Amino acid sequence: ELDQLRQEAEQLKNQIRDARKACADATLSQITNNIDPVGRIQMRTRRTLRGHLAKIYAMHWGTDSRLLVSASQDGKLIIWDSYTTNKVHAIPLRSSWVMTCAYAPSGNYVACGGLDNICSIYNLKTREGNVRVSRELAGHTGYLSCCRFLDDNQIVTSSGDTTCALWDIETGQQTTTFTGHTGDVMSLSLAPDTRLFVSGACDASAKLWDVREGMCRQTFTGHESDINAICFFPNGNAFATGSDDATCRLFDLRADQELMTYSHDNIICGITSVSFSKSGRLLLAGYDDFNCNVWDALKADRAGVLAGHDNRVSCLGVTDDGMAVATGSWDSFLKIWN
Amino acid sequence: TVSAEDKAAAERSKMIDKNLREDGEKARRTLRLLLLGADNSGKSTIVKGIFETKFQVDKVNFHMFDVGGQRDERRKWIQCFNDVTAIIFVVDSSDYNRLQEALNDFKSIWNNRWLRTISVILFLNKQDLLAEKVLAGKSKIEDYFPEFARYTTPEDATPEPGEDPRVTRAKYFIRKEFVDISTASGDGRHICYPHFTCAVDTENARRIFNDCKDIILQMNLREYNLV
């Protein structure tokens, strides 16, 4: 019966809320009030990477911490040489509309995708020395928003059809399909162990999914608007989510309840991308205000402003060694802050 | 200094820059339009997931992008089309019941933050069906739009070559509704060119060409005069 199902769902939600309230023994702010805050973290544009002739929509840092990708609206996926700013490669995309760009952990393949609903994996280490579409995964009914390389052969992708798909590059088939989201999924990050991943949806909900089990484990709410980006903590027991409300949030997996919130009351623009430092002390995030704020994850206090761009900021990322904070903006220029 | 490998890499980067600039110059001439409308409208049959069509008039090339399948809320993917030259909007003017839904959709697409600088083209479609319906008189627009009862055609407007008074009144009422929804906001950098077209009309892409020319001229004048 529909009424019985609704009553059961309401009872389960009430029980979950009561358990979360009971588990809220203390608060992160009170505990961290005894620690010494960092003072006025300032950064400068060490290297500026240009060449793109249209807006930049995505970026990924290579495992080597020296090469990074950038996808534009002009159907160009450029692999740079940040240490020297040389353009290592420039792949002309089949479709000019690309919304994501992922670099393989081994530096062998690069994944791109946008409104085409097709994830194109290009192989870089070709015998002929050229770059070509290694594979083209299809099956999503909506635009592909976020995608990451789980492994050299397994790739997990998120689309606008409210579902996520773990494919197989060798077989080009949907190994697993995860559904349940009531809105478009726009965020996806891979955990350090590459076993669990959190995806945010337009319904202001972040769902944790297991690569093997492939079943939802926890659902985190609290945001008043759509979620645009999510990133894991370096430890792996917590993550952060950014929405259009102009305030970031930090949740803990084990606690299952919201831990921290980050806002200043002087910021009204939405968050486009967030990232974590090597030690996880920082909460670098972007805004439509043409700047990035160095949010303090453990103190929820602003440190500095990387005001260098002229337009919106789309992508933000931090190298594995925590030595580069390269970001990208719609001005068609990347910038490496340090 | 820089070793031989570094110099070769720099030369490769310069060559890549040359190729990119050549491609950009080649692709900058064309103009990108975003085709929007409802299922009832005649979106596809206007100019003689993604579905892009290319057509050239007067030595000017237009790429019309017809993103489809992403119904309901257009957000999270309209942001891509924040640089297009115009949103070719198509609405079936014959259906009175669906007119209010079309007006709501136009309101949503007109006040959107990321589209606060592009000018739509209304392309009131299916003229013949509306003319036949109004001539028959079986369906009354006043049922769904009571204001139309007190509405009279403007006295300074130019009547069509042979349009009847009732058809002209209905056409002008629809156009006035859409234009009024257009002018409630966006004081500058916003226009709602309301062309009125029939199901078959060879001189159709010409209207898009003229309106794109006007939009470009207006933005150029705005830039020149603002400073």
Epitope: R66, L67, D81, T84, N86, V88, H89, G107, R127, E128, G129, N130 | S3, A4, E5, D6, K7, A8, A9, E11, R12, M15
Partner: single-chain antibody
Framework: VQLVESGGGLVQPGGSRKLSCSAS????????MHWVRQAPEKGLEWVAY????????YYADTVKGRFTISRDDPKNTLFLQMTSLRSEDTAMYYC??????????????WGQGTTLTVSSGSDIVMTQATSSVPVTPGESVSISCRSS???????????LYWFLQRPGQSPQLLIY???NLASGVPDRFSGSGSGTAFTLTISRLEAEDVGVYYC?????????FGAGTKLE
């Protein structure tokens, strides 16, 4: 991948000749070309190099104003024009394709070699002391190559290339940059260095793994090859 060189033959002293080299199976226009000269008795010796797009052209100090290198990308061909050939020019010429970028493998492929018979300062002095190191299959062997200059730029990259030329075959790249192994070669080969002396170590030998080992430097032109060590 395929590089076929032709045009060689018998040329009298003081004459002129043209050597053609056709490339297929890969993007020739994106790969720089090198002409490697191997004497009947001496080892490999760089002659000329042309970068992608013909922007940069380098010639060996031995041949100046006589050897011209050109490339035709639409025809995917490489031409070497030699004028006023002398006795010393008698040697075998090989085409080598190299692509320069971060993580690349220069000198990945070599040509089959075309013979040519003629009737009748401030340069690295890399020397290979080893001349003959007979071994037995199943054992481990070591080869040492010394350089007169520190082949370690400030960037931290050691510009060394170890090549192997088995009998009846053209030279094949084994190791590039002294750290990364070539593509397709077995993992047994191991390169090590300290900035002045470099060593190749093979844990297990094989019938196919036999020939002449050459050490070359790419720190700065002109390229200089080692004396060459032959196993047995």
């Amino acid at each position: 991948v395929q590089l076929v060189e032709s045009g060689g033959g018998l040329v009298q002293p003081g004459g002129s000749r043209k050597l053609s080299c056709s490339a297929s199976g890969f993007a020739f226009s994106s790969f720089g070309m090198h002409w490697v000269r191997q004497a009947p008795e001496k080892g490999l010796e760089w002659v000329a190099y042309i970068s992608s797009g013909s922007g940069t052209i380098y010639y060996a100090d031995t041949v100046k104003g006589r050897f011209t290198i050109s490339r035709d990308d639409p025809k995917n061909t490489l031409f070497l024009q030699m004028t006023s050939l002398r006795s010393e020019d008698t040697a075998m010429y090989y085409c080598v394709r190299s692509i320069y970028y971060y993580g690349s493998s220069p000198f990945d492929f070599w040509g089959q070699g075309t013979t040519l018979t003629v009737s009748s300062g401030s340069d690295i002095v890399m020397t290979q002391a080893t001349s003959s190191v007979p071994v037995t299959p199943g054992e481990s062997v070591s080869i040492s190559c010394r350089s007169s200059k520190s082949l370690l730029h400030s960037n931290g990259n050691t510009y060394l290339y170890w090549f192997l030329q088995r009998p009846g075959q053209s030279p094949q790249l084994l190791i590039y940059r002294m750290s990364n192994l070539a593509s397709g070669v077995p993992d047994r080969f191991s390169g090590s260095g300290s900035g002045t002396a470099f060593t190749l170590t093979i844990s297990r030998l094989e019938a196919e793994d036999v020939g002449v080992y050459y050490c070359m430097q790419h720190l700065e032109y002109p390229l200089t090859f080692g004396a060459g060590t032959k196993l047995e």
